[PDB]
Amino acid sequence: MQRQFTSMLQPGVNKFSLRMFGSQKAVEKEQERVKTAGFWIIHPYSDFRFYWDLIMLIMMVGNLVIIPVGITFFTEQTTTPWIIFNVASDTVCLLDLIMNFRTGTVNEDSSEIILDPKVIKMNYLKSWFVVDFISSIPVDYIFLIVEKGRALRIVRFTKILCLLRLLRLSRLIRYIHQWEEIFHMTYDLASAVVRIFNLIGMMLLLCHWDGCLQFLVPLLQDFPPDCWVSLNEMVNDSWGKQYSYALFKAMSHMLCIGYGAQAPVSMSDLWITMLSMIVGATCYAMFVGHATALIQSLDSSRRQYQEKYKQVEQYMSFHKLPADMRQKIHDYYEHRYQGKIFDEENILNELNDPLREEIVNFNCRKLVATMPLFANADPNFVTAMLSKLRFEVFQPGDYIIREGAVGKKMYFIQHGVAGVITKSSKEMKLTDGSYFGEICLLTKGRRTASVRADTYCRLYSLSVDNFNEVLEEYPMMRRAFETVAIDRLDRIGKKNSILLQKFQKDLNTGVFNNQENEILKQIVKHDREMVQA
Amino acid sequence: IFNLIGMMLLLCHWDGCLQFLVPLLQDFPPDCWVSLNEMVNDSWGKQYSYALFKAMSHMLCIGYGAQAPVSMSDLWITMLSMIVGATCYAMFVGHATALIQSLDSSRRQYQEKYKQVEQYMSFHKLPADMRQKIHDYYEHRYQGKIFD
Amino acid sequence: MQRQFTSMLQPGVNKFSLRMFGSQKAVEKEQERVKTAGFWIIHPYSDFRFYWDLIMLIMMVGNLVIIPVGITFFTEQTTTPWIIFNVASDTVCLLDLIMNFRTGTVNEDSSEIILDPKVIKMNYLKSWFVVDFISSIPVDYIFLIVEKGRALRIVRFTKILCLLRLLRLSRLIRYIHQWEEIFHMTYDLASAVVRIFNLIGMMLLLCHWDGCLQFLVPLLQDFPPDCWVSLNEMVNDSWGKQYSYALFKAMSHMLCIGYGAQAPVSMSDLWITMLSMIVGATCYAMFVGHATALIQSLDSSRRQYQEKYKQVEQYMSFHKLPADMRQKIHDYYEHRYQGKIFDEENILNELNDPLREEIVNFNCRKLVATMPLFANADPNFVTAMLSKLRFEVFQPGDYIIREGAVGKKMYFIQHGVAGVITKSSKEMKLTDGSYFGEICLLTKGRRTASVRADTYCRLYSLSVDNFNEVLEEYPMMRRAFETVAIDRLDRIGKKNSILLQKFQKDLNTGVFNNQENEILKQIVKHDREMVQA
């Protein structure tokens, strides 16, 4: 029995323990720390704590609802089921009070308190012991026994002292908050939804309590003729009708609907009504605030994008761009972001190297599969090349490369078809997967031919600095780039002596040409087949 | 919000005093609410309680006292009280909304960050397992806290 | 018939398909994928889906409004038009239920489900089939036929079962949400407006339903004497008056106005009233939240600028600047941003190279047209020079260049007139288009003369690093800059030997002076004419 009880009395390896502690090792360290101190000391995150708190929440929810009804609307409620229920709740509350002295505390400094006699007992005694004690002992039964050891005074005192059990709302709120924060940090719960559900539960409880009180106050006054119960002539009505009307009055005060049958007449009725109105107005204002917060949190993703585009529109209005230019900017913004807010330069920075590598490899899977030069070399080179590419979107008809300008980047086409146009040759179509801009980076010269975006082109651009940095690590890939750059230059206008000298020097050198020649031939054939489309 | 609560209590008290001062200065005309409710000779406690009840009912948008105003002075005093109470309650709702928004800013900012991350993942159309891995890493690295 | 039906049953090339898929090619790929699977399988984005959903929305809007009125306020509503309307709605709902088994699904993982027998049917059956089925079959007519195969019970059961058709609200909400998100991602709709219109429609529908229910409940109870209908003596009134009063009571409960004629008396009336109050209070809180969100989203552009300027004021207060300095800061902020929030360094970064080039060329069109050195050279150089300029604003009387200091940037005047002041010569006015600061960057020395801002000067500054980077690519422009720098230095104080040696070396060299001399002469003449103002 001791082993099974202890195994559940200490924290167990699960989702929440894995997110709390570093790993399994820290979980076992915490288990050993819990097992070391005291005979039985309950960890706040243990399964026994969870089940005991679930039982306590169920009991308090069932008690805070039934006690006021059984006290107010029921006369001479000292029947066997009532004493049985009261005694059961009393003993469960006493057991909870006892177990609270061996449960530890979660300090706000991210620490767990385990030491029993010096900090556990000495902190619960000076924080919540009096509230958890005067709401746990049967004060009404103690007073009845004392007096028994003219009955209107006794009945009134018993009914008044039975309201001390309503202080269990403190324990209910504490347990609800603790386990809701635990579930919040375990699951992906929304803060606004949890808070609005807490407020809805509190509003229902307060409305029920106000409904009970608006009849308890006339009941304690022996139903004066000025009270609403006597005016409506429902003194002898059934408990269901009385409770329904009292709850109706309380909820009408809460939701700002008005009064019951008429305006209050007696002073006690006036003050009870005004207190109920204050409580209900405060609760409804809090509910409106929570609803506003929830509605604002629901559409944050779209609202942020709308704010970004409104800032863009403000910039365009400041610079006084024409209508067609503004339409082009809108089209590009709506084709590039597609109505979504994010920033890759920071999202990818928040991730680690393996996750970023996996995401980039998944993004360019078709580019790797289609590229003749990719998928046929060292995959470390492949991931190094892919980790430096930048996503770009070019609208149809946009000159993405202009001849005569200096070369600073090349592009790998992922989506769409581009067109290479030269002043001395017909345009050649480049489909998906193909790439351009190699010769400008290789020869460090000007662009040879222009490139047009025939359709909406989604391209991956590689800067010259990153290209040289990744290519100085891998020269076989540089020779593979040259073996097709020379071919393309000879196809357009030759004048490729800068790369031709290096290629001839490599051919004359004793390099591993047995596989290099085959790789170059395959790459050239695939590139010319792709460009022949 | 505490300043506004104090101001609301003070204004409700002043309105309660005024709704009886105005009939008092008019020597309790028969059309006034005091004469209609027959509380002219009542004790000061009952009169103050009923006047404060009327003022607070106007403030919190609950309705009127015994009945709708009849005299013109009663009508205009009631309408001024309704205007003041409605303005005060709108300000109170605004302050409550601001307080509730400021209470959960730390969690809301993290939720916004993770929703932006999810939007990025949806834009790039990552598979389910990759999205689960990203979620696990984000929840094991930041532990639900926003900072940089 | 098959060709025309299929051409509209698959997605068509339009605005929304262009924003969904990459381009026309992906649209045709999706069309082929849809045409491949199944005999007839409806794509969610097809025109047939849109028109069928429009018909369904019209029918459900016309049905959820008329069914409660025809059930509650009309006695013995089994006339030919009613059966015709019910049968038409029934068959349209059954056709919609049948077509929902061949419509696919838009997965949250940005995917389209097309496979008919394994995932389309097996997902709609376990998600919404029971709700879409018990709200589609005529349960009331089936029960009537079964019973026909003491009439108060039959009438009550028929009226109760006729409320199962109100579950079409689920289909209405689903279709509205789907097509509103489609229009949101198609057009530039505002999220707050769409959400508040959805909530307004829901509030109207719920108010209408509550108005119908507050009379249906007394009707089912055969108008007890405690009901509000009997108390108001409107049992025999016309249907218009009864509906008007019931809707008035429901809307008064919804908008927190109060009750009808008086407070409820019967228990059923009390509970119906309390449920209506709860629903109306929740709806009004949601409406207040939506209104707050809409109002906050309406003035975001101005609010962000106000927040920025309040942060600036907080910084000034922290540093305890004098009143005149704070006024100067305010004047500069209000003359530079003009009350608009944006950040060019990020807005231009979110754009591509062609769009940025077009925007910059439009911004400096007058500068290009007016500059003698611009508009007469390679336009690649022109755009390279323009892409590196930075916008600056100088208030009148501000010393923008101080003599003796090191040179780090030059300025191109776009708006306003500046004044070159020297300790040994009178001030010379520089109008729009003219530029200064060349000699400090060219000779790498100190400034020769000071420059003052006579009016509000809007200038474009070019850093020394960017200037040298763009000028090492184009030397003819460097010689053109020198040919006027030497002239200006000789005009002020000569001592231009650093550039004079290079100019003499170029003149002695065999450079293409035939056009260079003419260009230099024209540039010098235009510059001196501009400076002679």
Ligand SMILES: Nc1ncnc2c1ncn2[C@@H]1O[C@@H]2COP(=O)(O)O[C@H]2[C@H]1O
């Ligand atoms: N005949 C061709 N087939 C395919 N691509 C080409 C051809 N000619 C040139 N290109 C590419 O088009 C690019 C245009 O600019 P670059 O001169 O920088 O580099 C060029 C090559 O990458």
Ligand SMILES: Nc1ncnc2c1ncn2[C@@H]1O[C@@H]2COP(=O)(O)O[C@H]2[C@H]1O
């Ligand atoms: N006579 C002049 N006419 C027009 N501009 C001048 C004249 N003298 C000097 N400048 C410009 O004024 C600038 C002041 O600072 P810098 O010496 O850097 O470079 C100077 C020239 O660009």
